[PDB]
Amino acid sequence: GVKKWECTVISNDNKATFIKELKLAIPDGESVPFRAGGYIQIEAPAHHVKYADFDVPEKYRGDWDKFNLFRYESKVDEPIIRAYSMANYPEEFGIIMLNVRIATPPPNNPNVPPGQMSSYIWSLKAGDKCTISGPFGEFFAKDTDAEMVFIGGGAGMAPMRSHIFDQLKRLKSKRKMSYWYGARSKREMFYVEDFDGLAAENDNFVWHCALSDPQPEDNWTGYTGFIHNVLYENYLKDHEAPEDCEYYMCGPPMMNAAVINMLKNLGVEEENILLDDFGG
Ligand SMILES: Cc1cc2nc3c(=O)[nH]c(=O)nc-3n(C[C@H](O)[C@H](O)[C@H](O)COP(=O)(O)OP(=O)(O)OC[C@H]3O[C@@H](n4cnc5c(N)ncnc54)[C@H](O)[C@@H]3O)c2cc1C
């Protein structure tokens, strides 16, 4: 069944420079009976949002002023609708948690209209009404005993976190798991305490974060580079079986393309390569 809820915005804080966590409260104490990796859809009426009305903390405002991103406006004439992945796992009841990347005009074409729905979501504030529908699902985990390798990037953290929490706390899985998240700098990292807790509460789970452009104020000593190079150079290249592992990835298009080609050049079969493609 596909139901529609008119939810209330609990919070819409920045978890990164260009990613907001949309926390929605399900009415009447109900819970969306969804699956990990699943998604819902958000509809929006005709509106006119201005980027100058966005609540961006000064911790993340840096690149917003450097690129003059608050100049953007977005008018929408007819009701629109997009899909967004749940960041929370099924037994986190009462709330729908989303990671929404703001779809600004591409840097290689900066004067096109901004992302319609993402700009509307980034204009939502605590107390606003948000109509969602679903749930829908297409990205699920295989029910085997093979090693699971999770690769994430950008807003792709949401389905990765939903799958990892679902396997460990609901399913109580003892399968070997590992998360590999790629971010630009340290201020783009979030859910760090969430995954550090799971890695400490479970021996079969570890996770690593790699910075492609670490900043001086980051004092970064961890891994550096793109996540496909880090995952390969620090683990997969010495793995006696790069296959026999199920790769669940979700990130930017070039992160996906880079991870796919790295895995297929390792001999990994496409049946063991599962991608949650956001279309962008
Ligand atoms: C199953 C599924 C799950 C998803 N999960 C998530 C999620 O968890 N988080 C998330 O952030 N997103 C997710 N998405 C993507 C999301 O649904 C939207 O595609 C995304 O939010 C952008 O939508 P928008 O309407 O804001 O951008 P659109 O208005 O669709 O614009 C897309 C991009 O194209 C650019 N553009 C606009 N006009 C032009 C032009 N004339 N020429 C060139 N470029 C142009 C815009 O700047 C924008 O960046 C998911 C998608 C699917 C299918």
Swiss-Prot record:
Compartmental location: Cell inner membrane
Co-factor(s): [2Fe-2S] cluster; FAD
GO biological process: sodium ion transport
Cell membrane listed as a keyword: yes
Cofactor detail note: Binds 1 [2Fe-2S] cluster.
Catalyzed reactions: a ubiquinone + n Na(+)(in) + NADH + H(+) = a ubiquinol + n Na(+)(out) + NAD(+)
Domain FAD-binding FR-type: residue ranges: 2-142
Record membrane topology: Single-pass membrane protein
Any one GO molecular-function label of the UniProt entry: FAD binding
Keyword Cell division: no
Keyword tags: 2Fe-2S, Cell inner membrane, Cell membrane, FAD, Flavoprotein, Ion transport, Iron, Iron-sulfur, Membrane, Metal-binding, NAD, Sodium, Sodium transport, Translocase, Transmembrane, Transmembrane helix, Transport, Ubiquinone
EC number: 7.2.1.1
Cellular component, GO annotation: plasma membrane
Purpose: NQR complex catalyzes the reduction of ubiquinone-1 to ubiquinol by two successive reactions, coupled with the transport of Na(+) ions from the cytoplasm to the periplasm. The first step is catalyzed by NqrF, which accepts electrons from NADH and reduces ubiquinone-1 to ubisemiquinone by a one-electron transfer pathway.
Family: Belongs to the NqrF family.
Subunit structure and binding partners: Composed of six subunits; NqrA, NqrB, NqrC, NqrD, NqrE and NqrF.
Name of protein: Na(+)-translocating NADH-quinone reductase subunit F
Organism, as annotated: Vibrio cholerae serotype O1 (strain ATCC 39541 / Classical Ogawa 395 / O395)
Biological classification of the source: Bacteria, Pseudomonadati, Pseudomonadota, Gammaproteobacteria, Vibrionales
Gene: nqrF
Residue numbers of the full-length protein present here: 129 to 408 of 408
